[PDB]
Amino acid sequence: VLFEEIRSLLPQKYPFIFIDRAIEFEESKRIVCVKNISGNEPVFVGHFPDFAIMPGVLIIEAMAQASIILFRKSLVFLLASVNNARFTKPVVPGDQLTIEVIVEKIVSRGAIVQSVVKVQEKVVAKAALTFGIVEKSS
Amino acid sequence: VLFEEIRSLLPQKYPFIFIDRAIEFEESKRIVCVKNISGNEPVFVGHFPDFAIMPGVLIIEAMAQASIILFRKSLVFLLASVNNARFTKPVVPGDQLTIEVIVEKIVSRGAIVQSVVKVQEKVVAKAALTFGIVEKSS
Amino acid sequence: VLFEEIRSLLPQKYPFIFIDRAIEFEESKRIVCVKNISGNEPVFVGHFPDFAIMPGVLIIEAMAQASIILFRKSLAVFLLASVNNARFTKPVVPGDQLTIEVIVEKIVSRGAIVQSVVKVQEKVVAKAALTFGIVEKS
Amino acid sequence: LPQKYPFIFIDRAIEFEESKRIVCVKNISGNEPVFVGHFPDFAIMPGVLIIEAMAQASIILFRKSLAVFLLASVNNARFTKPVVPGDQLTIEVIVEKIVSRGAIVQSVVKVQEKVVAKAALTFGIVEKSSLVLEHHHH
Amino acid sequence: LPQKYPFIFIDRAIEFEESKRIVCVKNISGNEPVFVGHFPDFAIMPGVLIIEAMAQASIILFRKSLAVFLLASVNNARFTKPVVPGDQLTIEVIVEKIVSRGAIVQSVVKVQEKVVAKAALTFGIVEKSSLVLEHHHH
Amino acid sequence: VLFEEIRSLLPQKYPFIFIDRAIEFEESKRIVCVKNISGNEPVFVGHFPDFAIMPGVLIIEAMAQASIILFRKSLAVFLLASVNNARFTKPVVPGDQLTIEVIVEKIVSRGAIVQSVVKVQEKVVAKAALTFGIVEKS
Numbered sequence A, B: 001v002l003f004e005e006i007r008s009l010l011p012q013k014y015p016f017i018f019i020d021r022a023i024e025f026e027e028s029k030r031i032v033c034v035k036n037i038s039g040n041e042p043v044f045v046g047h048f049p050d051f052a053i054m055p056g057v058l059i060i061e062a063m064a065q066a067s068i069i070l071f072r073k074s075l076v077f078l079l080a081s082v083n084n085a086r087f088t089k090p091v092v093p094g095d096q097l098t099i100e101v102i103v104e105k106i107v108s109r110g111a112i113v114q115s116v117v118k119v120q121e122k123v124v125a126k127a128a129l130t131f132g133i134v135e136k137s138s
Numbered sequence C, F: 001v002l003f004e005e006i007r008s009l010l011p012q013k014y015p016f017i018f019i020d021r022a023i024e025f026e027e028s029k030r031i032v033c034v035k036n037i038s039g040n041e042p043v044f045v046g047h048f049p050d051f052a053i054m055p056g057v058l059i060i061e062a063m064a065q066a067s068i069i070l071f072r073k074s075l076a077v078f079l080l081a082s083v084n085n086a087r088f089t090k091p092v093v094p095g096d097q098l099t100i101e102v103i104v105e106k107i108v109s110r111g112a113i114v115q116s117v118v119k120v121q122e123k124v125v126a127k128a129a130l131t132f133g134i135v136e137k138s
Numbered sequence D, E: 001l002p003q004k005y006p007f008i009f010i011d012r013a014i015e016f017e018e019s020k021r022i023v024c025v026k027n028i029s030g031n032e033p034v035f036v037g038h039f040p041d042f043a044i045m046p047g048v049l050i051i052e053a054m055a056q057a058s059i060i061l062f063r064k065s066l067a068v069f070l071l072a073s074v075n076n077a078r079f080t081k082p083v084v085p086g087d088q089l090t091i092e093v094i095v096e097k098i099v100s101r102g103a104i105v106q107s108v109v110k111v112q113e114k115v116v117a118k119a120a121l122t123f124g125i126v127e128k129s130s131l132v133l134e135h136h137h138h
Helices: A003-009 A056-072 B003-009 B056-072 C003-009 C056-072 D047-064 D129-136 E047-064 E129-136 F003-009 F056-072
Strands: A021-026 A030-036 A077-087 A096-105 A110-119 A122-133 B021-026 B030-036 B077-087 B096-105 B110-119 B122-133 C021-026 C030-036 C079-088 C097-106 C113-119 C124-133 D012-017 D021-025 D068-079 D090-097 D104-110 D115-126 E012-017 E021-025 E068-079 E090-097 E104-110 E115-126 F021-026 F030-036 F079-088 F097-106 F113-119 F124-133
Touching: A003 A021, A003 A056, A021 A056, A030 A056, A056 A077, A056 A096, A056 A110, A056 A122, A056 B056, A056 B077, A077 B056, B003 B021, B003 B056, B021 B056, B030 B056, B056 B077, B056 B096, B056 B110, B056 B122, C003 C021, C003 C056, C021 C056, C030 C056, C056 C079, C056 C097, C056 C113, C056 C124, C056 D047, C056 D068, C079 D047, D012 D047, D021 D047, D047 D068, D047 D090, D047 D104, D047 D115, D115 D129, E012 E047, E021 E047, E047 E068, E047 E090, E047 E104, E047 E115, E047 F056, E047 F079, E068 F056, E115 E129, F003 F021, F003 F056, F021 F056, F030 F056, F056 F079, F056 F097, F056 F113, F056 F124
Parallel strands: none
Antiparallel strands: A021 A030, A030 A096, A077 A122, A077 B077, A096 A110, A110 A122, B021 B030, B030 B096, B077 B122, B096 B110, B110 B122, C021 C030, C030 C097, C079 C124, C079 D068, C097 C113, C113 C124, D012 D021, D021 D090, D068 D115, D090 D104, D104 D115, E012 E021, E021 E090, E068 E115, E068 F079, E090 E104, E104 E115, F021 F030, F030 F097, F079 F124, F097 F113, F113 F124
């Protein structure tokens, strides 16, 4: 799944896109996606001026956007719960995020997912995410 | 504590500043800070084009930056653990985030904190955050 | 009037939105709008890098956009044609709220005239008398 | 100039006369940040930003001779014509008085021959006493 | 132009000759995004972006007469002189052949009289067969 | 060579950084660098909004910045003076890695000449012959 199938699948547009390509896809349980970390991205100007590192909260969003792509390839998604999120290794410009998402429930008008992010072949982040589904509440 | 005492206290610079002012401060246990949500911020262009809402991961960063200000008014801080993070109400341009941070441990080369964010006087987010302290590991 | 109406009513989009919501509005006589000043806005990296002040000219645009909301919720690119008695007193910085008051004095003569006073919590910081012009499709 | 991008509005000063007169040229183009949202329908230079080109042409004089000069009074400002990418401003500022900790000037902005705007500006002279002043206001 | 900001490099086409020649003007200023980092020491228009002004002046011809024309060959390109804010490019493009699904042109860029750059460009003509082509490459 | 050396060695800072790291480097003969193409980069919102392609000219700059790393780890604003035999074949999109190979042919004659070939996974997508110039402090 190339980047521009991803664009209309994601409601997010720049500056808040964190998915570049999807390698694997199991229709409603599993997906893996790729995020290229390049020094030319906007967040690296201020985080940090001295040392460029991907913020941990943006890795969670990279987990969440990979979940939304799975969900909307599977027949507004707001992240509502973050549990057991662990951040292990610094993420540097030049790395590729291999973002893994496993589905745990799609039954509570929302979704519990459990995600694992890896650089070349070693884990750098994990989290258990839960979303909520709303559309123009008013 | 006005915005430009905050600037040198925070290692983050735009586009990744989420603290505008600190109202209260207890030297090493408690702080409250303010974040103004304005539609002219860069994240609202792509999140979302149809409906402007503050992402949940950026509220966690607003919690984390309020913790760093407490820590560096108290004699590189990387967020390493997110636990029990709950997101309750949508955050809209025009709202003020009253970010609360309570300190739980500063004893593990890092810090466990437990944060509560509120709009006018009602809770919209909470989280238990844990950081790690590194400086030019090489 | 919340921000999603503000954004559909204003012809200005980012990076030139200076109204976040309206709190009191009465049908072609008087309106009051709120602008949150945030340190994460795009103008503050340049004005100034040394000391972040809301530019005075952009307070005038905030006065202008507030009455465009008033002009247009009242039965087109409204462009500024004249400014008289523009007085600015106190620097407004990130962390402040601008309560923008606009009072109509004369409406369309192919252009409208308004008196506007901007305040921080209740101390006056800017006031001006604005006249706009209504437009072609040249 | 004390400012940088995104809020720099001068490129060249063609004629400099020690203490009372300059002519400056800021020149308009499509890649400036303001035209992305003002307007998406079609690009016009905002009238308030034309006032900056006047104020910045002023402040270049007052410290190329004889250094944050905040905008204090804008009287008799008329915006006769729209400014469009491809055009080139030709800002002339005549100093009228250096009365006290401020200065009154008369500015006229010109495109190739026609006159598109004029204003009468008055500023205020401080650098860093200004901080504690801004501290005392809060 | 198929592009928008931050990658628009034309403002006015002064002379248009149906199928073989234009002269265009992109004009340089300090508020363009490229000069924030090229260079922080002092601002020079990158030579590769001057090639865009040539290529965009070309592509305006080929569809103002007779619509994504990707850059395929850049031969004999010389950058004699630096381009600085305040300057104004004057891009001339002579069409030499519309051979097949592409076009060979000779461009010369001029500041007030002197010549700052020239190049010989060749493009490729597709719109949307280009997607599945890009799909087949992956 | 990781990114923090890349950023101190390159004179180009954002938004004009096009090298993320170097993987093999040998002292004034040959260098190989890596560029991650991400959909969250600033150029892709404008080139194109319809279809995100890495501009060909910025691949040349990536060739140029890679050899500036090579020129400067080998005992100043290196500016592009000539481009010959620039051939571009395949569109490179977000999700791809650019493996930038540069080979020195002649070093400082007040300028250097290099042959550069850029690749995606191993298929060649861009190649050029670059000559730069070393500079004044005009």
